[PDB]
Amino acid sequence: QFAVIGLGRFGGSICKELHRMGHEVLAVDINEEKVNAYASYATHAVIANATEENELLSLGIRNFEYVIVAIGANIQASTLTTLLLKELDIPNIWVKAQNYYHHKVLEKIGADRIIHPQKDMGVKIAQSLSDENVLNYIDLSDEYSIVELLATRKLDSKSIIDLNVRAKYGCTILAIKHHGDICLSPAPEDIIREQDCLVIMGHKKDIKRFENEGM
Amino acid sequence: QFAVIGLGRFGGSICKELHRMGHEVLAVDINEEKVNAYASYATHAVIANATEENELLSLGIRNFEYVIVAIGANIQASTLTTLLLKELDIPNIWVKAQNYYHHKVLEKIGADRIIHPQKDMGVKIAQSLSDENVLNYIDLSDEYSIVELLATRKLDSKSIIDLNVRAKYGCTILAIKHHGDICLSPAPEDIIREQDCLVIMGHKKDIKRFENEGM
Amino acid sequence: QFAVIGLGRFGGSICKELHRMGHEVLAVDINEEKVNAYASYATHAVIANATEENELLSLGIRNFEYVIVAIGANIQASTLTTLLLKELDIPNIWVKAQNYYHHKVLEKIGADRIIHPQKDMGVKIAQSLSDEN
Amino acid sequence: QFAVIGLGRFGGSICKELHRMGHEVLAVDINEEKVNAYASYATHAVIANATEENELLSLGIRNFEYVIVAIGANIQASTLTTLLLKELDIPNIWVKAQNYYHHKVLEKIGADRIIHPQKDMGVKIAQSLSDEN
Amino acid sequence: QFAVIGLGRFGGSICKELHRMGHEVLAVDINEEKVNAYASYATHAVIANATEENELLSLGIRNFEYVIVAIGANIQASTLTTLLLKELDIPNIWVKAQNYYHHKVLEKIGADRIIHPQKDMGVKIAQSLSDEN
Amino acid sequence: QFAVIGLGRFGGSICKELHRMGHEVLAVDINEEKVNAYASYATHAVIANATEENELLSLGIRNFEYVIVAIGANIQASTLTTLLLKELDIPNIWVKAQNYYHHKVLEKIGADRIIHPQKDMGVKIAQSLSDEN
Amino acid sequence: QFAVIGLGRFGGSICKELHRMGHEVLAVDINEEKVNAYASYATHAVIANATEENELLSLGIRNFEYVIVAIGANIQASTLTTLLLKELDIPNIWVKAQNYYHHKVLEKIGADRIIHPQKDMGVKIAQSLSDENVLNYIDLSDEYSIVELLATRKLDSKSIIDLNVRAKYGCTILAIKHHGDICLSPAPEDIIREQDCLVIMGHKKDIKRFENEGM
Amino acid sequence: QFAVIGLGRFGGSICKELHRMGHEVLAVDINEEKVNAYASYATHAVIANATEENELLSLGIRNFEYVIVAIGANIQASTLTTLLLKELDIPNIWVKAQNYYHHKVLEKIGADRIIHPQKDMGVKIAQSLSDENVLNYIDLSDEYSIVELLATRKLDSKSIIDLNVRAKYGCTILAIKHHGDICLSPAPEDIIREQDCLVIMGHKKDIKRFENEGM
Ligand SMILES: Nc1ncnc2c1ncn2[C@@H]1O[C@H](COP(=O)(O)OP(=O)(O)O)[C@@H](O)[C@H]1O
Ligand SMILES: Nc1ncnc2c1ncn2[C@@H]1O[C@H](COP(=O)(O)OP(=O)(O)O)[C@@H](O)[C@H]1O
Ligand SMILES: Nc1ncnc2c1ncn2[C@@H]1O[C@H](COP(=O)(O)OP(=O)(O)O)[C@@H](O)[C@H]1O
Ligand SMILES: Nc1ncnc2c1ncn2[C@@H]1O[C@H](COP(=O)(O)OP(=O)(O)O)[C@@H](O)[C@H]1O
Ligand SMILES: Nc1ncnc2c1ncn2[C@@H]1O[C@H](COP(=O)(O)OP(=O)(O)O)[C@@H](O)[C@H]1O
Ligand SMILES: Nc1ncnc2c1ncn2[C@@H]1O[C@H](COP(=O)(O)OP(=O)(O)O)[C@@H](O)[C@H]1O
Ligand SMILES: Nc1ncnc2c1ncn2[C@@H]1O[C@H](COP(=O)(O)OP(=O)(O)O)[C@@H](O)[C@H]1O
Ligand SMILES: Nc1ncnc2c1ncn2[C@@H]1O[C@H](COP(=O)(O)OP(=O)(O)O)[C@@H](O)[C@H]1O
């Protein structure tokens, strides 16, 4: 179902994670050491030059719905490989881009999705920096969002009804995670202890307000 | 308030994003071209060798609450920088790790947070791969999660009350985004049209079940 | 009618010859000396970075039916330029290829004609060697 | 009858084309991969450093009426090879020139024909652009 | 009982002297010549990259109570080796420091003793100059 | 009474320690920063190129009974300096050796004592490892 | 009148010596330090790339009757320089050759004189080796030579008439240098003291004979 | 009788020339190709590292009265070799110097003669440049010299008595070389034809005078 062509810092993580999730993954790499190291973290692991068409054919690359092109430094190899894959009519080709130019040429040679890892981690890290309590989040729209917050010493031993967010800030609490244990859509009697995960939902500015005065 | 020491693919994104959010950021780089290119995307931009203590002092680095060490290839430079910063009693030092070894030595020299960008993008990309319908998601815990899904033709013109997720699958719908318009905590009469954003919340396997039989 | 983007050993020859035949040619080059040397061998000669879209727009590159991409060594610059030209709906884009890979990426990004100079002169020279008469 | 010393974009084409025409061609190259790839496109293919006289002798280079010096980037190697060949009394020595200077030194050391591939393809491409019909 | 990882001016001396005293010493080195030269001055001598964990395991490095990290110039290799050894729960890890920074990072990753050779020989030489008698 | 020509890891230690013991020491260094840093750790500190005879004369190097040549990496500078000092009839010349070869040439050019810092600290460290008590 | 293009071990010596003799010399070098060091040993000294024609023109290189190309390692630079100089119609171009190939190409591009320094010093050193008594010499032809000899204890207090070289060995004595004082075409009564300079002239083998039995 | 340790541009010439003169020479070289190439130009040729004492012993280096150290670039190897040779009490050790420092250390480690090839060829070339007619010469003293001159079109078909040098310039002609044929101490009736070798003897300034007005 999944084939990962470059087993580096980026692609290797994709391989290991997909394997950990329970999907079947074929790992490819030109470097034998890399192939050996990922033998345990993949259904199958093969030594192959992804820029060589007959080798791609030998891999049975056609058996796959998703092929990930994760060769970092060598732009030539990456775009050539992506090209060969597009020739073989692979349904989904995901390639890691190094820069603007690489993104452009991948764009035109029919890459289905282009990933800028360090860029995205850039914005994500910026998000966590801007607010140290936000552990994670998802934006529903330009104005509305669901936010994951780390409870500070302002929130310990407080009940949901005490923190009347539904009226005071127009936001609603969705979940509380205490010592790994999880409470979904909790009732107003429930207690939030410090260092716990708190999942709020509402307007961005309203959530910021609640963070400011509340915690 | 924020200082970014390495203006590369990773650090540059952090800088640009922090600047876009409205925070004041001091960008550092040994490469003059990089400093010039990030002049517009930062409050201040300086040419400096982050491995030279007197230069760090010249930057007024102690005036900052958060310093980001984002020098990629040069592990020596990274750990040296982190060390010097730790000597200067910087409250929060975030460093990009290249490998396991780098993570360990940064860990021991008192790095406050160590980031593996390509790894994390690895797992999230794996997440988007496992379901093309999940546009985004957030893990509340090992078993429970909030998921954003792309509506298929199986869900078109279906009501929330028609798709009884709260009893049949034990999960709860949180939001519906239809042509950009947004419905928060929608009522059972509401309609879901295909290709719209659907926000479900619950157990991972249960949501997977709902994906399987429902859509 | 004709624009030549790279004034090197290859492109410069195209420019000079087209000019000698009596056609009007706009010569482009990032190197000022090259532009100066071909001032006499072209209707107009301009300093410009062919990988910069706004510069291409400033050249009035769309007013041309034929644009020749003759940047040799820099594969990246060549393909990026070809790309920008393809975006600007240029009717005929002819590019000099460095190798097989360059030929492939140029092929896919919609190059109208891809030339392998050394190859073609190769077969031509072989022809001349086969019968000197 | 024919020997091609540099199996690159230029020389490789000469080799392949001469072989395709039905002439017997000896392909030389310092790079083993190139030699391997042109085994099928030549009567014989040999790994050799064309700047080493004893290797040239080992090739039986004197048995040839036409020897082609097609080493691109390395001007030094090119002129050294041409020189050694001129010493071995080769009847016809054709060399690919990189620039004006290379053309001059090849000219003086007795090169029988000096080819500027990109230039000639330049004028021919200009010809084709001038009248597409 | 003793393992010396870097057989240079510093570590080689440790090895030779420990061997001369009658203790059993395992000498390690990435350079084959060094390993060969110290075969006679050690119980066992092995070619190995001290920055590679599986090689460390292959050496049976855990069987040793004292491991000496004596890699000079390469600070990275030194700290990486020290780190790997600290992971393998080596009881006593003594490392040669190049500078203040190296001393600090070795200090934090749990080096049992950090030696500054030139400094100590400095103070001792000063002692000898102060009273030659 | 004492002159230290190289203020590095080795020589700087000698200087600082001799100064701490109460002897008068003249510190030399080609690097101004080094001279500045050791201003407090020496009776006098001077910027000078030890391979330049007139500079040595300007230092009043002959007024000293002991001159320490502690220039590490630069073997040439070290031996040249030692040589100039031997010409100037310096009573005691002590030089830091880099390797066997350096030891040999220093040996022949009349060095009074040749020190191998890393070697000696090597045996010393081996001693400390043999009996931790 | 004289221009030296390469100020290295070879060319620098030519420059310095020509300057010491009293001729006016323009020294050229691409290396600024070299140009600075030869400022005192030349009429003029200039930083210039000898492979750049416009720079050569800027030097006023055509105003010179003799131009010396003494660039060692870089054969390409040497031949290119020689070529450019030949284009500028320089009357006399002397170039240092690195090897046989270099000698040949310089020969063909119209070098007026090609020098192999280490070769020539090779043969002369061989000459001084064959007889430690020959301090210097000059070959008139393949068979005949003029030789300068160091007097041994076999020749001490001997007269020219005592050592009848003109008949017994067919050679003729030309000069005697005794404690620096010099005697040209000395009379038969003159005495030769040991360790003095003796200038004989004749056939090589005959002089060797005289060395053998005489001294 | 002679051993040459470095078979390069310099040492190889010494070897070949000594061999051509008829002396027996042992050539040493660490490079096998060099040893093979000089097999024909030496009595014996051996592959050896001159910095290795036991190899020197294996060569039978002790059998030689003269050992030439002609290793160019590697100063360390040169001085180390010279040192080893001095330890083995070789009577005559001649070494090629690269620079001032090398000359100094060779001087102190007991080198019997130190040669600066390119320097000496420098002064020699300067001599031939200063006067194009002087082919060679030997200085008897600061003021007096014997000079070899190339006859110009001023001297063709002239008799020695016509060019009364013995009175007019105080100099005396010693030899005339015509088409390889040689005339020693020629009588006044003899003719000098152009392009012939002419050997004059006398005062330097006087010889210059004769060159000026005569030829
Ligand atoms: N032609 C190729 N075929 C297959 N695998 C390749 C090829 N070129 C590179 N790779 C693999 O891709 C990986 C690149 O990893 P890396 O350079 O760390 O990129 P990233 O930083 O994106 O992880 C390497 O592990 C290498 O083995
Ligand atoms: N010692 C240093 N001090 C300051 N900046 C540095 C230093 N070393 C490297 N840099 C900067 O850090 C940047 C590294 O970026 P890059 O190598 O792309 O890392 P990444 O791939 O993680 O973005 C370079 O642009 C360089 O200018
Ligand atoms: N990005 C660019 N935009 C515009 N001109 C460029 C760009 N990159 C290179 N050039 C020009 O193209 C020319 C390339 O010529 P060259 O490298 O000699 O190729 P060739 O050998 O095929 O002629 C150079 O003279 C350079 O000035
Ligand atoms: N010294 C040499 N002897 C023999 N062959 C050589 C030598 N140097 C280079 N070559 C060969 O000549 C070829 C030159 O090809 P290339 O650099 O592509 O020139 P071009 O661009 O003109 O084709 C290479 O394949 C190389 O193997
Ligand atoms: N990664 C490594 N693994 C094992 N041994 C190493 C490694 N790197 C260097 N060494 C060895 O360590 C020794 C270091 O010696 P040297 O550089 O002279 O240090 P010092 O000057 O302290 O003696 C070398 O002999 C080298 O072979
Ligand atoms: N020619 C010279 N004259 C005077 N001082 C010199 C000369 N060459 C080097 N030095 C000084 O000697 C010091 C050498 O120290 P270093 O290279 O660290 O050797 P070590 O590692 O043995 O201390 C340098 O600080 C330099 O300033
Ligand atoms: N292209 C050039 N133009 C001018 N000077 C040059 C050029 N290339 C080299 N040189 C000079 O010529 C000198 C070469 O000297 P060197 O390598 O010692 O030759 P040699 O050993 O024959 O003296 C260098 O000092 C360098 O500065
Ligand atoms: N350790 C050594 N033992 C023997 N021969 C050596 C050694 N090192 C170098 N050589 C020889 O000395 C020669 C040096 O020649 P080269 O570098 O041209 O110097 P030069 O310019 O004085 O001729 C080389 O041919 C090499 O084979």
Residue numbers in the entry:
A (entry chain B), B (entry chain A), G (entry chain A), H (entry chain B): 8 to 222
C (entry chain H), D (entry chain G), E (entry chain G), F (entry chain H): 8 to 140
What text comes from the article?
KtrAB is a cation channel with a nucleotide-dependent RCK domain. The structure of the KtrAB complex revealed a homodimeric membrane protein (KtrB) assembled with a cytosolic RCK octameric ring, formed by the KtrA protein. KtrA binds nucleotides, ATP or ADP. ATP binding induces the adoption of a square-conformation by the octameric ring and increased K+ flux activity through KtrAB; ADP binding results in a non-square conformation and decreased flux.
